[PDB]
Amino acid sequence: GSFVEMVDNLRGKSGQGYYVEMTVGSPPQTLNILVDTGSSNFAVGAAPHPFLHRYYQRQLSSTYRDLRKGVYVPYTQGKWEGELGTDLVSIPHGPNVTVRANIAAITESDKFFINGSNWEGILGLAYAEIARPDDSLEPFFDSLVKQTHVPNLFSLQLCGASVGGSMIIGGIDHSLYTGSLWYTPIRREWYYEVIIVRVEINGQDLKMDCKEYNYDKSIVDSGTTNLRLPKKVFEAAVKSIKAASSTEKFPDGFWLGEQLVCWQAGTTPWNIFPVISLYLMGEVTNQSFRITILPQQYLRPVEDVATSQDDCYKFAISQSSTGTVMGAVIMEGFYVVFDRARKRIGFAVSACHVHDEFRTAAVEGPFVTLDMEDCGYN
Numbered sequence: 421g422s423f424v425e426m427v428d429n430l431r432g433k434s435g436q437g438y439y440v441e442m443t444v445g446s447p448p449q450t451l452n453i454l455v456d457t458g459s460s461n462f463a464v465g466a467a468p469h470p471f472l473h474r475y476y477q478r479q480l481s482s483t484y485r486d487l488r489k490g491v492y493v494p495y496t497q498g499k500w501e502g503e504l505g506t507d508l509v510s511i512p513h514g515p516n517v518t519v520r521a522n523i524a525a526i527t528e529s530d531k532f533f534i535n536g537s538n539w540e541g542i543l544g545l546a547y548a549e550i551a552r553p554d555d556s557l558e559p560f561f562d563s564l565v566k567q568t569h570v571p572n573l574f575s576l577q578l579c580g581a582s583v584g585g586s587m588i589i590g591g592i593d594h595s596l597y598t599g600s601l602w603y604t605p606i607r608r609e610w611y612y613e614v615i616i617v618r619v620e621i622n623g624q625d626l627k628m629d630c631k632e633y634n635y636d637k638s639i640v641d642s643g644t645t646n647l648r649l650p651k652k653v654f655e656a657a658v659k660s661i662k663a664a665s666s667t668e669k670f671p672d673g674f675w676l677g678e679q680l681v682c683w684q685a686g687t688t689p690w691n692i693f694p695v696i697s698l699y700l701m702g703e704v705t706n707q708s709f710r711i712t713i714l715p716q717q718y719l720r721p722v723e724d725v726a727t728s729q730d731d732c733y734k735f736a737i738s739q740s741s742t743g744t745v746m747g748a749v750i751m752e753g754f755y756v757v758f759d760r761a762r763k764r765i766g767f768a769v770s771a772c773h774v775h776d777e778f779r780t781a782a783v784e785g786p787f788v789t790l791d792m793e794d795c796g797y798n
Protein backbone atom coordinates (compact mmCIF):
# COMPACT_ATOMS: atom_id res chain seq x y z
CA GLY A 421 0.00 0.00 0.00
CA SER A 422 -1.18 2.52 0.63
CA PHE A 423 -3.18 5.67 -0.13
CA VAL A 424 -2.86 7.03 3.41
CA GLU A 425 0.91 6.72 2.95
CA MET A 426 0.86 8.94 -0.16
CA VAL A 427 -1.26 11.67 1.43
CA ASP A 428 0.69 14.87 2.06
CA ASN A 429 3.67 13.59 0.06
CA LEU A 430 4.01 16.79 -2.01
CA ARG A 431 5.75 19.96 -0.84
CA GLY A 432 6.37 23.35 -2.38
CA LYS A 433 7.11 27.04 -2.16
CA SER A 434 4.39 29.44 -3.31
CA GLY A 435 4.60 29.92 -7.07
CA GLN A 436 7.59 27.54 -7.15
CA GLY A 437 5.89 24.27 -8.09
CA TYR A 438 5.16 21.06 -6.19
CA TYR A 439 7.72 18.30 -5.80
CA VAL A 440 7.69 14.73 -4.53
CA GLU A 441 10.54 12.66 -3.12
CA MET A 442 12.04 9.98 -5.36
CA THR A 443 15.19 7.85 -5.33
CA VAL A 444 17.34 6.98 -8.34
CA GLY A 445 20.05 4.37 -8.72
CA SER A 446 21.73 1.93 -6.34
CA PRO A 447 22.48 2.78 -3.71
CA PRO A 448 19.39 5.02 -3.73
CA GLN A 449 19.91 8.77 -4.13
CA THR A 450 16.96 10.82 -2.88
CA LEU A 451 15.96 13.89 -4.87
CA ASN A 452 13.01 16.27 -4.95
CA ILE A 453 11.28 15.96 -8.33
CA LEU A 454 8.78 18.54 -9.55
CA VAL A 455 5.49 16.88 -10.51
CA ASP A 456 4.70 18.34 -13.95
CA THR A 457 1.67 17.27 -16.00
CA GLY A 458 2.58 19.60 -18.89
CA SER A 459 5.64 17.58 -19.92
CA SER A 460 6.56 13.97 -20.67
CA ASN A 461 10.24 13.81 -19.64
CA PHE A 462 11.70 12.52 -16.38
CA ALA A 463 14.84 14.58 -15.78
CA VAL A 464 17.13 15.49 -12.89
CA GLY A 465 20.13 17.75 -12.50
CA ALA A 466 23.23 15.58 -12.86
CA ALA A 467 25.75 18.45 -12.60
CA PRO A 468 26.58 21.10 -10.00
CA HIS A 469 24.53 24.28 -10.09
CA PRO A 470 24.22 27.39 -7.89
CA PHE A 471 20.51 26.66 -7.40
CA LEU A 472 20.88 22.93 -6.61
CA HIS A 473 21.80 21.42 -3.25
CA ARG A 474 21.75 17.91 -4.74
CA TYR A 475 22.17 16.23 -8.10
CA TYR A 476 22.25 12.83 -9.77
CA GLN A 477 25.68 11.18 -9.80
CA ARG A 478 25.41 8.35 -12.32
CA GLN A 479 28.93 7.35 -11.29
CA LEU A 480 27.49 6.28 -7.91
CA SER A 481 24.75 3.97 -9.25
CA SER A 482 25.59 0.35 -9.99
CA THR A 483 22.33 0.33 -12.00
CA TYR A 484 22.84 3.32 -14.31
CA ARG A 485 22.79 2.46 -18.01
CA ASP A 486 23.55 4.95 -20.79
CA LEU A 487 21.48 5.34 -23.94
CA ARG A 488 24.41 7.08 -25.64
CA LYS A 489 21.85 9.74 -26.64
CA GLY A 490 21.46 13.41 -25.83
CA VAL A 491 18.21 15.33 -25.37
CA TYR A 492 17.04 18.94 -25.25
CA VAL A 493 13.71 19.88 -23.70
CA PRO A 494 12.19 23.37 -24.07
CA TYR A 495 9.44 24.61 -21.78
CA THR A 496 7.19 27.62 -22.00
CA GLN A 497 9.95 29.20 -19.93
CA GLY A 498 13.26 27.49 -19.26
CA LYS A 499 15.09 24.73 -21.09
CA TRP A 500 17.76 22.13 -20.52
CA GLU A 501 19.85 19.47 -22.23
CA GLY A 502 21.39 16.33 -20.84
CA GLU A 503 22.26 12.68 -21.32
CA LEU A 504 19.64 9.97 -21.63
CA GLY A 505 20.13 6.92 -19.44
CA THR A 506 17.99 4.45 -17.53
CA ASP A 507 18.22 3.65 -13.84
CA LEU A 508 16.10 2.26 -11.02
CA VAL A 509 13.57 4.64 -9.48
CA SER A 510 11.33 4.49 -6.43
CA ILE A 511 8.88 6.84 -4.74
CA PRO A 512 9.40 6.71 -0.94
CA HIS A 513 5.87 7.95 -0.16
CA GLY A 514 4.18 6.29 -3.11
CA PRO A 515 3.49 2.72 -4.22
CA ASN A 516 5.91 0.10 -2.91
CA VAL A 517 7.74 -0.60 -6.16
CA THR A 518 10.94 0.08 -8.09
CA VAL A 519 11.10 0.37 -11.88
CA ARG A 520 13.69 0.91 -14.58
CA ALA A 521 12.82 4.31 -16.02
CA ASN A 522 14.30 6.54 -18.69
CA ILE A 523 16.15 9.41 -17.01
CA ALA A 524 17.68 12.52 -18.55
CA ALA A 525 20.75 13.74 -16.68
CA ILE A 526 20.66 17.52 -16.90
CA THR A 527 24.11 18.83 -17.87
CA GLU A 528 23.18 22.38 -18.89
CA SER A 529 20.05 24.45 -18.31
CA ASP A 530 18.78 27.99 -18.78
CA LYS A 531 15.92 29.50 -16.75
CA PHE A 532 14.82 26.04 -15.57
CA PHE A 533 15.99 25.53 -12.00
CA ILE A 534 14.71 28.02 -9.43
CA ASN A 535 16.72 29.89 -6.82
CA GLY A 536 15.74 28.41 -3.48
CA SER A 537 13.30 25.86 -4.91
CA ASN A 538 13.73 22.59 -3.07
CA TRP A 539 13.35 20.48 -6.23
CA GLU A 540 16.26 19.23 -8.35
CA GLY A 541 14.31 17.38 -11.05
CA ILE A 542 11.10 17.20 -13.02
CA LEU A 543 8.66 14.34 -13.60
CA GLY A 544 6.68 14.67 -16.82
CA LEU A 545 3.37 12.89 -16.24
CA ALA A 546 1.90 13.60 -19.67
CA TYR A 547 2.02 11.18 -22.59
CA ALA A 548 4.77 9.93 -24.90
CA GLU A 549 3.55 11.94 -27.91
CA ILE A 550 5.05 15.11 -26.35
CA ALA A 551 8.18 13.31 -25.12
CA ARG A 552 11.59 14.44 -26.36
CA PRO A 553 13.08 13.80 -28.70
CA ASP A 554 10.28 11.46 -29.81
CA ASP A 555 7.62 9.15 -28.38
CA SER A 556 10.14 6.29 -28.42
CA LEU A 557 11.14 7.43 -24.91
CA GLU A 558 8.68 5.76 -22.56
CA PRO A 559 7.72 8.33 -19.89
CA PHE A 560 8.00 7.43 -16.23
CA PHE A 561 4.33 6.71 -15.53
CA ASP A 562 4.13 4.53 -18.63
CA SER A 563 7.12 2.58 -17.31
CA LEU A 564 5.50 2.28 -13.87
CA VAL A 565 2.17 1.00 -15.17
CA LYS A 566 3.96 -1.30 -17.65
CA GLN A 567 6.27 -2.84 -15.01
CA THR A 568 3.90 -3.09 -12.02
CA HIS A 569 0.28 -3.61 -11.01
CA VAL A 570 -0.20 0.09 -10.25
CA PRO A 571 -3.43 1.05 -12.04
CA ASN A 572 -3.13 3.59 -14.85
CA LEU A 573 -4.45 6.60 -13.01
CA PHE A 574 -3.28 9.24 -10.58
CA SER A 575 -4.84 12.14 -8.72
CA LEU A 576 -3.27 15.42 -7.60
CA GLN A 577 -4.40 17.44 -4.58
CA LEU A 578 -2.55 20.76 -4.57
CA CYS A 579 -3.12 22.80 -1.41
CA GLY A 580 -2.07 26.44 -1.23
CA ALA A 581 -0.98 28.32 1.88
CA SER A 582 5.07 26.76 2.85
CA VAL A 583 2.85 24.71 0.52
CA GLY A 584 2.00 21.03 0.12
CA GLY A 585 -0.39 18.47 -1.24
CA SER A 586 -0.79 14.82 -2.17
CA MET A 587 -0.13 12.72 -5.26
CA ILE A 588 -2.15 9.52 -5.02
CA ILE A 589 -0.44 7.23 -7.53
CA GLY A 590 -2.82 4.60 -8.87
CA GLY A 591 -6.18 5.53 -7.42
CA ILE A 592 -8.56 7.97 -5.77
CA ASP A 593 -8.45 8.81 -2.06
CA HIS A 594 -12.03 9.62 -1.11
CA SER A 595 -11.08 11.35 2.13
CA LEU A 596 -9.38 14.06 0.08
CA TYR A 597 -12.43 15.49 -1.67
CA THR A 598 -16.10 16.14 -0.98
CA GLY A 599 -19.02 15.93 -3.33
CA SER A 600 -18.85 13.99 -6.57
CA LEU A 601 -16.14 13.92 -9.21
CA TRP A 602 -16.95 15.46 -12.59
CA TYR A 603 -15.06 14.23 -15.64
CA THR A 604 -14.06 15.91 -18.82
CA PRO A 605 -12.68 13.82 -21.70
CA ILE A 606 -8.99 13.90 -22.48
CA ARG A 607 -9.39 15.13 -26.06
CA ARG A 608 -6.15 13.47 -27.15
CA GLU A 609 -3.32 11.72 -25.32
CA TRP A 610 -0.42 14.08 -25.78
CA TYR A 611 -0.81 16.84 -23.23
CA TYR A 612 -3.66 16.57 -20.78
CA GLU A 613 -5.88 18.30 -23.30
CA VAL A 614 -9.40 19.36 -22.31
CA ILE A 615 -12.10 21.36 -24.09
CA ILE A 616 -13.42 24.49 -22.37
CA VAL A 617 -16.95 25.03 -23.66
CA ARG A 618 -17.99 28.18 -21.77
CA VAL A 619 -16.46 30.84 -19.53
CA GLU A 620 -18.35 32.96 -17.00
CA ILE A 621 -17.17 35.82 -14.80
CA ASN A 622 -19.44 36.59 -11.83
CA GLY A 623 -22.22 34.66 -13.53
CA GLN A 624 -21.80 36.57 -16.80
CA ASP A 625 -20.82 34.84 -20.02
CA LEU A 626 -17.81 36.26 -21.84
CA LYS A 627 -19.89 35.35 -24.93
CA MET A 628 -16.85 34.62 -27.05
CA ASP A 629 -16.60 31.92 -29.67
CA CYS A 630 -16.16 28.59 -27.87
CA LYS A 631 -13.07 28.03 -29.99
CA GLU A 632 -11.28 31.07 -28.58
CA TYR A 633 -11.14 29.31 -25.21
CA ASN A 634 -9.14 26.43 -26.67
CA TYR A 635 -7.38 28.39 -29.40
CA ASP A 636 -4.43 26.15 -30.06
CA LYS A 637 -5.29 23.96 -27.06
CA SER A 638 -6.31 23.80 -23.43
CA ILE A 639 -4.27 21.69 -21.00
CA VAL A 640 -4.03 20.88 -17.30
CA ASP A 641 -0.44 21.54 -16.20
CA SER A 642 0.45 21.24 -12.52
CA GLY A 643 3.84 22.61 -13.64
CA THR A 644 2.54 26.06 -14.64
CA THR A 645 1.68 28.31 -11.70
CA ASN A 646 -0.75 30.74 -13.34
CA LEU A 647 -3.97 30.47 -15.27
CA ARG A 648 -2.83 31.16 -18.84
CA LEU A 649 -5.35 32.31 -21.46
CA PRO A 650 -5.21 32.97 -25.22
CA LYS A 651 -4.78 36.66 -26.09
CA LYS A 652 -8.42 37.31 -26.94
CA VAL A 653 -9.81 35.41 -23.95
CA PHE A 654 -7.19 36.93 -21.66
CA GLU A 655 -8.06 40.48 -22.66
CA ALA A 656 -11.78 39.82 -22.20
CA ALA A 657 -11.24 38.47 -18.68
CA VAL A 658 -8.91 41.27 -17.56
CA LYS A 659 -11.44 43.81 -18.79
CA SER A 660 -14.11 41.92 -16.84
CA ILE A 661 -11.99 41.59 -13.70
CA LYS A 662 -10.92 45.24 -13.92
CA ALA A 663 -14.52 46.44 -14.05
CA ALA A 664 -15.30 44.16 -11.11
CA SER A 665 -12.51 45.90 -9.19
CA SER A 666 -12.67 49.49 -10.49
CA THR A 667 -13.56 50.52 -6.92
CA GLU A 668 -9.82 50.30 -6.12
CA LYS A 669 -6.86 51.04 -8.38
CA PHE A 670 -3.69 49.17 -9.36
CA PRO A 671 -0.89 49.71 -11.89
CA ASP A 672 -1.71 48.09 -15.22
CA GLY A 673 1.66 46.43 -14.65
CA PHE A 674 -0.22 44.56 -11.94
CA TRP A 675 -2.58 43.09 -14.53
CA LEU A 676 0.59 42.15 -16.42
CA GLY A 677 2.00 40.27 -13.42
CA GLU A 678 4.83 42.81 -13.28
CA GLN A 679 3.97 44.84 -10.18
CA LEU A 680 2.49 43.74 -6.84
CA VAL A 681 -0.53 44.65 -4.71
CA CYS A 682 -0.67 44.97 -0.93
CA TRP A 683 -3.37 45.82 1.60
CA GLN A 684 -3.35 46.40 5.36
CA ALA A 685 -3.21 42.88 6.80
CA GLY A 686 -6.64 41.22 6.82
CA THR A 687 -8.07 44.06 4.73
CA THR A 688 -8.06 42.46 1.28
CA PRO A 689 -11.17 43.53 -0.62
CA TRP A 690 -11.98 40.01 -1.81
CA ASN A 691 -15.57 40.99 -2.52
CA ILE A 692 -14.65 43.24 -5.46
CA PHE A 693 -12.89 40.44 -7.27
CA PRO A 694 -15.20 38.10 -9.21
CA VAL A 695 -15.38 34.34 -9.52
CA ILE A 696 -14.41 32.76 -12.84
CA SER A 697 -16.42 29.77 -14.04
CA LEU A 698 -14.82 27.34 -16.49
CA TYR A 699 -17.31 24.97 -18.09
CA LEU A 700 -15.59 21.76 -19.15
CA MET A 701 -17.05 19.34 -21.67
CA GLY A 702 -18.75 16.43 -19.93
CA GLU A 703 -19.09 12.68 -20.43
CA VAL A 704 -22.55 12.55 -22.08
CA THR A 705 -24.05 14.31 -25.08
CA ASN A 706 -24.77 18.03 -24.74
CA GLN A 707 -23.55 17.72 -21.15
CA SER A 708 -20.93 19.85 -19.45
CA PHE A 709 -20.05 20.90 -15.92
CA ARG A 710 -18.32 23.91 -14.42
CA ILE A 711 -15.57 24.57 -11.90
CA THR A 712 -15.67 27.92 -10.12
CA ILE A 713 -12.51 29.82 -9.19
CA LEU A 714 -12.29 32.29 -6.31
CA PRO A 715 -10.02 35.33 -6.45
CA GLN A 716 -8.17 33.68 -3.56
CA GLN A 717 -6.74 31.49 -6.36
CA TYR A 718 -5.86 33.86 -9.20
CA LEU A 719 -4.60 36.45 -6.69
CA ARG A 720 -1.52 34.72 -5.49
CA PRO A 721 0.08 35.80 -2.19
CA VAL A 722 3.71 36.91 -2.10
CA GLU A 723 5.42 37.90 1.15
CA ASP A 724 7.09 41.31 1.29
CA VAL A 725 9.04 42.80 4.20
CA ALA A 726 7.66 46.08 5.52
CA THR A 727 7.42 48.09 8.72
CA SER A 728 3.80 46.95 8.34
CA GLN A 729 3.72 43.38 7.03
CA ASP A 730 0.55 43.81 4.96
CA ASP A 731 -0.97 41.30 2.52
CA CYS A 732 0.55 41.27 -0.96
CA TYR A 733 -0.69 39.41 -4.04
CA LYS A 734 0.38 38.98 -7.65
CA PHE A 735 -2.15 38.70 -10.47
CA ALA A 736 -1.97 35.03 -11.46
CA ILE A 737 -3.75 35.12 -14.85
CA SER A 738 -1.27 35.55 -17.72
CA GLN A 739 -1.50 35.95 -21.47
CA SER A 740 -0.63 32.93 -23.60
CA SER A 741 0.42 32.13 -27.15
CA THR A 742 0.38 28.34 -26.58
CA GLY A 743 -3.30 27.92 -25.68
CA THR A 744 -5.06 27.87 -22.33
CA VAL A 745 -3.17 26.43 -19.37
CA MET A 746 -5.15 25.39 -16.29
CA GLY A 747 -2.23 25.87 -13.96
CA ALA A 748 -1.64 25.20 -10.29
CA VAL A 749 -3.73 28.14 -9.09
CA ILE A 750 -6.73 26.60 -10.84
CA MET A 751 -5.86 23.12 -9.58
CA GLU A 752 -5.36 24.28 -5.99
CA GLY A 753 -8.53 23.61 -4.07
CA PHE A 754 -9.72 20.87 -6.38
CA TYR A 755 -8.99 17.15 -6.38
CA VAL A 756 -7.95 16.41 -9.97
CA VAL A 757 -7.99 12.83 -11.24
CA PHE A 758 -5.84 11.95 -14.24
CA ASP A 759 -7.83 8.89 -15.28
CA ARG A 760 -5.47 7.78 -18.03
CA ALA A 761 -7.31 4.43 -18.01
CA ARG A 762 -10.73 5.83 -18.91
CA LYS A 763 -9.19 8.73 -20.88
CA ARG A 764 -10.67 11.51 -18.74
CA ILE A 765 -9.93 14.10 -16.04
CA GLY A 766 -12.16 14.34 -12.96
CA PHE A 767 -12.64 17.35 -10.72
CA ALA A 768 -14.02 17.60 -7.20
CA VAL A 769 -13.83 20.18 -4.43
CA SER A 770 -10.62 19.54 -2.51
CA ALA A 771 -10.56 18.87 1.21
CA CYS A 772 -8.01 21.71 1.36
CA HIS A 773 -10.07 24.28 -0.44
CA VAL A 774 -10.15 28.05 -0.71
CA HIS A 775 -12.80 29.02 1.86
CA ASP A 776 -14.02 32.55 1.17
CA GLU A 777 -16.33 33.86 3.88
CA PHE A 778 -19.38 34.17 1.58
CA ARG A 779 -18.31 32.29 -1.59
CA THR A 780 -17.12 28.78 -2.41
CA ALA A 781 -15.04 27.28 -5.18
CA ALA A 782 -17.27 24.62 -6.66
CA VAL A 783 -17.62 21.76 -9.11
CA GLU A 784 -21.20 21.71 -10.37
CA GLY A 785 -23.17 19.73 -12.92
CA PRO A 786 -24.91 18.79 -15.01
CA PHE A 787 -25.04 21.68 -17.46
CA VAL A 788 -26.43 21.41 -20.98
CA THR A 789 -24.29 22.85 -23.78
CA LEU A 790 -24.88 22.30 -27.49
CA ASP A 791 -22.33 21.90 -30.28
CA MET A 792 -19.62 21.23 -27.69
CA GLU A 793 -17.51 19.54 -30.37
CA ASP A 794 -17.34 22.91 -32.15
CA CYS A 795 -15.08 24.14 -29.33
CA GLY A 796 -11.99 22.13 -30.18
CA TYR A 797 -9.56 24.11 -32.29
CA ASN A 798 -8.38 22.54 -35.53
Ligand SMILES: CSC[C@H](NC(=O)[C@H]1NO[C@@H]2OCC[C@@H]21)C(=O)N[C@@H](CC(C)C)[C@@H](O)C[C@@H](C)C(=O)N[C@H](C(=O)NCC(C)C)C(C)C
Nearest residue numbers: 435436437458459460494495496497498550641643644645
Ligand atom coordinates in the same frame (compact mmCIF):
# COMPACT_ATOMS: atom_id res chain seq x y z
C1 LIG B 1 6.20 31.44 -17.52
S1 LIG B 1 4.99 30.10 -17.40
C2 LIG B 1 5.44 29.08 -15.95
C3 LIG B 1 5.73 27.57 -16.06
N1 LIG B 1 6.64 27.36 -14.95
C4 LIG B 1 6.27 27.93 -13.62
O1 LIG B 1 5.28 28.52 -13.44
C5 LIG B 1 7.19 27.76 -12.40
N2 LIG B 1 8.26 28.56 -12.14
O2 LIG B 1 8.72 28.14 -10.96
C6 LIG B 1 7.86 27.02 -10.62
O3 LIG B 1 8.23 25.71 -11.37
C7 LIG B 1 6.90 25.12 -11.76
C8 LIG B 1 5.96 25.97 -11.30
C9 LIG B 1 6.74 27.33 -11.20
C10 LIG B 1 6.38 27.10 -17.41
O4 LIG B 1 6.51 27.94 -18.21
N3 LIG B 1 6.86 25.76 -17.95
C11 LIG B 1 6.99 24.35 -17.45
C12 LIG B 1 7.16 24.19 -15.92
C13 LIG B 1 8.64 24.36 -15.39
C14 LIG B 1 8.91 23.45 -14.17
C15 LIG B 1 9.79 24.13 -16.42
C16 LIG B 1 5.92 23.41 -18.01
O5 LIG B 1 5.07 22.95 -17.03
C17 LIG B 1 5.08 24.06 -19.14
C18 LIG B 1 4.56 22.97 -20.10
C19 LIG B 1 3.23 23.37 -20.68
C20 LIG B 1 5.55 22.80 -21.28
O6 LIG B 1 6.12 23.74 -21.73
N4 LIG B 1 5.79 21.46 -21.85
C21 LIG B 1 6.68 21.33 -22.94
C22 LIG B 1 5.91 21.78 -24.20
O7 LIG B 1 4.83 21.35 -24.35
N5 LIG B 1 6.37 22.72 -25.22
C23 LIG B 1 7.68 23.41 -25.23
C24 LIG B 1 7.39 24.88 -25.45
C25 LIG B 1 8.69 25.77 -25.41
C26 LIG B 1 6.60 25.13 -26.75
C27 LIG B 1 7.07 19.82 -23.02
C28 LIG B 1 5.88 18.94 -23.38
C29 LIG B 1 8.24 19.58 -24.00
